[PDB]
């Protein structure tokens, strides 16, 4: 059957490419036009979290919107107090090659992983007063590129072995394995309900997953290069993906296709991270060229800039109550914007 | 002061974490970090054993200098995504087997990997302590199997004189940054532990040429 795929699979991907054109009667940038812009957005650096000595590759807020963990390439994981820039914890890592960290929604745990191929879970509310390694979740064959807690006993990791995996933290066993991608999974993102999560890979595709069924429910492809970052719209019914080709895109889960594209000709650098503000009107994007643009999400206009870094903005995050934006960069400084 | 009794003890905790981070970084600044690369068949596994799954660290203190050597052979991912993690190593020990010119698409593939990391944007200032492994096996491989099989344009001897040194010119010619990078080639002896000596003498030259470049004295 033409090496047993093109008989239907190459035309079945034209049924899809013809269904996604039937349902595109008008684009987002046509119906969401003649509405007021957001005006220029001057966010000033309200904080500067100093104390990492190597590059900061990952950052993640706690749900209380005050504490945030950050992982740098020195074997340290710092839990910051963002209001008063104190260091609550500084957690020494067995492996120094951290590429991702995550804070539990209960605030009791933090996770960490990287080139060691392991996601370590750290217990923060120990009775001894220090932070112990509550668990080491091994089983991926590639570097862990992103981890995210579902609760204190479920964490979805994603790896450079083209695979995402749900985990049971009490045991050390991955109860589901998500095996759709043909490239390195570089980033995942839980839906606000924690029943769906999207993942983006170096094969320029993002896949919607179902945490229970374990099945790739949808697949999105608009980019020409690797998807470094992916974040759900706060509704849970769209997400934005930033890639190496300097373009963010807003994909629509119910319409099952790309709604908009956030590009600019002065921009040529990859996108390291991406994130929405609360209400999802602003799309923040951490670029390779030291900046962090602020895209009007419903329109497509860059309605601001956060140009306060002296190196690649490796990770940003919008606090869960919407107050502030934290950005890390390979210069060892977390800046809390607002 | 507007700091409560507990807001002040939380800042004393913060400043005591600050010194352990400042101190624990000074303790890991005394250590020279070395990426270890090369198409791994026989050479990379022996040089870390010559000196004593995702990343493999290897400590060896030679002459009051603590070395860390990061072997990334067992990663097996898109190298372009994690290679920037190693931006800032002192040097890149690039192990190579002279016994792969006749295995000829292997020696010519190691030259394809050397050209990939030697010309990254992340390694424009990182020298390369290029080892050439198994020059004993390159002795008697040429005794039957000559050169020119992996290098058709090689118009020269076969007596190991211009034989080996024609390898050493092909790699060092692949350096596209002759100004901001210095390849330090060595033919690994394997009967002596002067391999760590060459690493030590090639790292003290990288550090000094960084120090002189740090203070702008060049």
């Amino acid at each position, epitope marked *: 059957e033409l090496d047993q795929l093109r008989q239907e699979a190459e035309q079945l991907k034209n049924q899809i490419r013809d269904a996604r054109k039937a349902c595109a009667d008008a684009t987002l940038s046509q119906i969401t036009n003649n509405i007021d812009p957001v005006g220029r957005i001057q966010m000033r650096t309200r904080r500067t979290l100093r104390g990492h000595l190597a590059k900061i590759y990952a950052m993640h807020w706690g749900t209380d919107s*005050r*504490l945030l963990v950050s992982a740098s390439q020195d074997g340290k994981l710092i839990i910051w*107090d963002s209001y*008063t820039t*104190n260091k*609550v*914890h500084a957690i020494p890592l067995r492996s120094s090659w951290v590429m991702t960290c995550a804070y539990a929604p209960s*605030g009791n745990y933090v996770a960490c992983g990287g080139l060691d191929n392991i996601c370590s879970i750290y217990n923060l*509310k120990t*009775r*001894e*007063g*220090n932070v112990r390694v509550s668990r080491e979740l091994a089983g991926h064959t590639g570097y862990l590129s992103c981890c995210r807690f579902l609760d204190d006993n479920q964490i979805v990791t994603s790896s450079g072995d083209t695979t995402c995996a749900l985990w049971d933290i009490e045991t050390g066993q991955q109860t589901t394995t998500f095996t759709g991608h043909t490239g390195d999974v570089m980033s995942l993102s839980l839906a606000p309900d924690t029943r769906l999560f999207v993942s983006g890979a170096c094969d320029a595709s993002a896949k919607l997953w179902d945490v229970r069924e374990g099945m790739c429910r949808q697949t999105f492809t608009g980019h020409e290069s690797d998807i470094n970052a992916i974040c759900f719209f706060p509704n849970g019914n769209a997400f934005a993906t930033g890639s190496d080709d300097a373009t963010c895109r807003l994909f629509d889960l119910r319409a099952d296709q790309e709604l908009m594209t956030y590009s600019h000709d002065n921009i040529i650098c990859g996108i390291t991270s991406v994130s929405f503000s609360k209400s999802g009107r602003l799309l923040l994007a951490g670029y390779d060229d030291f900046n962090c643009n602020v895209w009007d999400a419903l329109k497509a206009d860059r309605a601001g800039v956060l140009a306060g870094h002296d190196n690649r903005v490796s990770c940003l995050g919008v606090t869960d109550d919407g107050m502030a934006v934290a950005t890390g960069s390979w210069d060892s400084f977390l800046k809390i914007w607002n | 002061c*507007t700091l*409560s*009794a*507990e*807001d002040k*003890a*939380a800042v*004393e*905790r913060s400043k*005591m974490i600050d010194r352990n981070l400042r101190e624990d970084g000074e303790k890991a600044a005394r250590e020279v970090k070395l990426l270890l690369l090369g198409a791994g068949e026989s050479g990379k596994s022996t040089i870390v054993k010559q000196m004593k799954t995702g990343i493999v660290e290897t400590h060896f203190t030679f002459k009051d200098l603590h070395f860390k050597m990061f072997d990334v052979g067992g990663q097996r991912s898109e190298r372009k995504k994690w290679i920037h993690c190693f931006e800032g190593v002192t040097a890149i020990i690039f192990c190579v087997a002279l016994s792969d010119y006749d295995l000829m698409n292997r020696m010519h593939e190691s030259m394809k990997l050397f050209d990939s990391i030697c010309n990254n944007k992340w390694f424009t200032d990182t020298s390369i302590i290029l080892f050439l492994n198994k020059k004993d096996l390159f002795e008697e491989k040429i005794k039957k199997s000559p050169l020119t099989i992996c290098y058709p344009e090689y118009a020269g001897s076969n007596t190991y004189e211009e034989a080996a040194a024609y390898i050493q010119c092909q790699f060092e010619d692949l350096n596209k940054r002759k100004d901001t990078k210095e390849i330090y080639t060595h033919f690994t002896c394997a009967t002596d532990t002067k391999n760590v000596q060459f690493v030590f003498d090639a790292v003290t030259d990288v550090i000094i040429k960084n120090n002189l470049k740090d203070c702008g004295l060049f």
Partner: single-chain antibody
Amino acid sequence: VQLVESGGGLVQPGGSRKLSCSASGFAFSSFGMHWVRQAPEKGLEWVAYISSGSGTIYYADTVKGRFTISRDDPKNTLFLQMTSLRSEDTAMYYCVRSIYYYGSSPFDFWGQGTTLTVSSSDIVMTQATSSVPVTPGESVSISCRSSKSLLHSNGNTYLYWFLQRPGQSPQLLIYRMSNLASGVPDRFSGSGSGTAFTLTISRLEAEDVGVYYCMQHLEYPLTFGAGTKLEL
């Protein structure tokens, strides 16, 4: 986790002893260490404080020059050097571990206490009640007024509720306010705002019996309210 302190006993006035509390079971270096005195058939009284790293030491005005708190982190021991012991220093001296960061719970663990029978401006915590009789299954309310608003400008009101069962060391029940210490039954609840505070017990049990102290941790010295005993 355990704090076992020995030393003391009987001492003739003007003498000197060396109390020591040998911590074991936790990161002793990370914890600030209080001493909390309890005179015979009386209330709790803060004595000394040495923070983690020893970079801070506070004392009560009563012992400002006579007592010397000091800690041996490699040995995991806290010391109290007493000089010129007066008769008013007779008490059971508890060693208390307290760790301070955003969201922590100071005073969460109390040593069993070492007795010391000597021979022979400040926040005032007022809970003038005493011997509130009740039977199990009942809902009890306890209050203690502060001479100053314990609500600090940063939102934290620094009121701690302790429970000392008969023959035990005190137990942390509620830190800053309405924050239930880990390991405490959730029937306890803490309420208040400003200078009037209430410890509400939803359904009293057979173990919820003993003196209930409240403490201000707003500024030093640390003052405990007098005991509010609950006898059934």
